[PDB]
Write an enzyme that holds these catalytic residues in place. Structure first.
Site, PDB file in Angstrom:
ATOM      1  N   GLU A   1       0.863  -1.202   0.000  1.00 32.30           N
ATOM      2  CA  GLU A   1       0.000   0.000   0.000  1.00 32.30           C
ATOM      3  C   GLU A   1       0.881   1.228   0.000  1.00 32.30           C
ATOM      4  O   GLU A   1       0.568   2.174  -0.772  1.00 32.30           O
ATOM      5  CB  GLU A   1      -0.908  -0.045   1.209  1.00 32.30           C
ATOM      6  CG  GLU A   1      -2.042  -1.064   1.084  1.00 32.30           C
ATOM      7  CD  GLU A   1      -3.154  -0.773   0.048  1.00 32.30           C
ATOM      8  OE1 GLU A   1      -3.106   0.295  -0.557  1.00 32.30           O
ATOM      9  OE2 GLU A   1      -3.973  -1.704  -0.214  1.00 32.30           O
TER      10      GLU A   1
ATOM     11  N   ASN B   1      -7.686   9.114  -5.621  1.00 33.93           N
ATOM     12  CA  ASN B   1      -8.523   8.087  -6.259  1.00 33.93           C
ATOM     13  C   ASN B   1      -9.391   8.773  -7.320  1.00 33.93           C
ATOM     14  O   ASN B   1      -9.647   9.965  -7.251  1.00 33.93           O
ATOM     15  CB  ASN B   1      -9.378   7.401  -5.195  1.00 33.93           C
ATOM     16  CG  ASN B   1      -8.564   6.844  -4.039  1.00 33.93           C
ATOM     17  OD1 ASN B   1      -8.906   6.996  -2.864  1.00 33.93           O
ATOM     18  ND2 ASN B   1      -7.505   6.183  -4.397  1.00 33.93           N
TER      19      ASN B   1
ATOM     20  N   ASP C   1     -12.572   8.710  -7.700  1.00 38.06           N
ATOM     21  CA  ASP C   1     -13.853   9.239  -7.191  1.00 38.06           C
ATOM     22  C   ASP C   1     -13.594  10.588  -6.518  1.00 38.06           C
ATOM     23  O   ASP C   1     -14.581  11.134  -5.982  1.00 38.06           O
ATOM     24  CB  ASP C   1     -14.555   8.184  -6.321  1.00 38.06           C
ATOM     25  CG  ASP C   1     -13.911   7.941  -4.954  1.00 38.06           C
ATOM     26  OD1 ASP C   1     -12.796   8.509  -4.700  1.00 38.06           O
ATOM     27  OD2 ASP C   1     -14.528   7.255  -4.124  1.00 38.06           O
TER      28      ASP C   1
ATOM     29  N   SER D   1     -11.745  10.996  -3.730  1.00 40.41           N
ATOM     30  CA  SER D   1     -11.180  10.677  -2.404  1.00 40.41           C
ATOM     31  C   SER D   1      -9.664  10.543  -2.531  1.00 40.41           C
ATOM     32  O   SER D   1      -9.111  10.505  -3.626  1.00 40.41           O
ATOM     33  CB  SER D   1     -11.791   9.451  -1.833  1.00 40.41           C
ATOM     34  OG  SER D   1     -11.404   8.315  -2.538  1.00 40.41           O
TER      35      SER D   1
ATOM     36  N   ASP E   1      -6.291   8.327  -0.501  1.00 42.00           N
ATOM     37  CA  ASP E   1      -5.783   7.340   0.480  1.00 42.00           C
ATOM     38  C   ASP E   1      -4.557   7.896   1.216  1.00 42.00           C
ATOM     39  O   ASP E   1      -3.693   8.489   0.559  1.00 42.00           O
ATOM     40  CB  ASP E   1      -5.422   6.026  -0.228  1.00 42.00           C
ATOM     41  CG  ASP E   1      -6.581   5.180  -0.780  1.00 42.00           C
ATOM     42  OD1 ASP E   1      -7.744   5.478  -0.510  1.00 42.00           O
ATOM     43  OD2 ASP E   1      -6.264   4.142  -1.431  1.00 42.00           O
TER      44      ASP E   1
ATOM     45  N   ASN F   1      -8.845   5.508   3.273  1.00 40.76           N
ATOM     46  CA  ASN F   1      -9.609   6.329   2.303  1.00 40.76           C
ATOM     47  C   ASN F   1     -10.463   7.410   2.974  1.00 40.76           C
ATOM     48  O   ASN F   1     -11.205   7.136   3.902  1.00 40.76           O
ATOM     49  CB  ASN F   1     -10.517   5.392   1.495  1.00 40.76           C
ATOM     50  CG  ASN F   1     -11.109   6.081   0.297  1.00 40.76           C
ATOM     51  OD1 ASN F   1     -12.290   6.480   0.389  1.00 40.76           O
ATOM     52  ND2 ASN F   1     -10.337   6.219  -0.751  1.00 40.76           N
TER      53      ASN F   1
ATOM     54  N   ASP G   1     -15.220  -4.236   9.251  1.00 41.39           N
ATOM     55  CA  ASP G   1     -16.409  -3.641   8.587  1.00 41.39           C
ATOM     56  C   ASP G   1     -17.220  -4.675   7.811  1.00 41.39           C
ATOM     57  O   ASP G   1     -18.370  -4.339   7.424  1.00 41.39           O
ATOM     58  CB  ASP G   1     -16.033  -2.474   7.682  1.00 41.39           C
ATOM     59  CG  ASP G   1     -17.239  -1.665   7.232  1.00 41.39           C
ATOM     60  OD1 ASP G   1     -17.872  -1.041   8.092  1.00 41.39           O
ATOM     61  OD2 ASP G   1     -17.509  -1.677   6.037  1.00 41.39           O
TER      62      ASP G   1
END
Ligand code: NA
Length: 129
Positions: free
Chosen positions: A35, A46, A48, A50, A52, A59, A101
């Site tokens: 990562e 990202n 969209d 967003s 990270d 995110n 989650d």
């Protein structure tokens, strides 16, 4: 801060990630390697809109506030900048929520694509833990 491999393994272990939700320490170290390259300051935008953040690329659409991700949540109740600190406490606390989650470590796409199913114990080889 750019962590060494065993230095990160020891910090993750201290903060309770070894076997958290059944994921061995090597899975967490492998995830951080792919990562962020073990760099707490890593950021990646990202598609969209967003971003990270940090050693585990957490995110802003769900987990942290960066003020520029419209309609997003902040479920770890932290500024995303907290995830860039040399102190990984905020990243670990938030990763514990993420991995709880429902999809486990599949939340980390580099873990799913590069760590899942591999010899992850290799990532803690040689470390005094
Ligand atoms: Na957010």
């Amino acid at each position: 801060k750019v962590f060494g491999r065993c230095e990160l393994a020891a910090a993750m272990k201290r903060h309770g990630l070894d076997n958290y939700r059944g994921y061995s320490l090597g899975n967490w170290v492998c995830a951080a390697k792919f990562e962020s390259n073990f760099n707490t300051q890593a950021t990646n935008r990202n598609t969209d809109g967003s971003t990270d953040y940090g050693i585990l690329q957490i995110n802003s659409r769900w987990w942290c506030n960066d003020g520029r991700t419209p309609g997003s949540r902040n479920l770890c109740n932290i500024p995303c900048s907290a995830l860039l600190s040399s102190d990984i406490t905020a990243s670990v606390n938030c990763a514990k929520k993420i991995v709880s989650d429902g999809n486990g470590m599949n939340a980390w796409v580099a873990w799913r694509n590069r760590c899942k199913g591999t010899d992850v114990q290799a990532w803690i080889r040689g470390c005094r833990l």
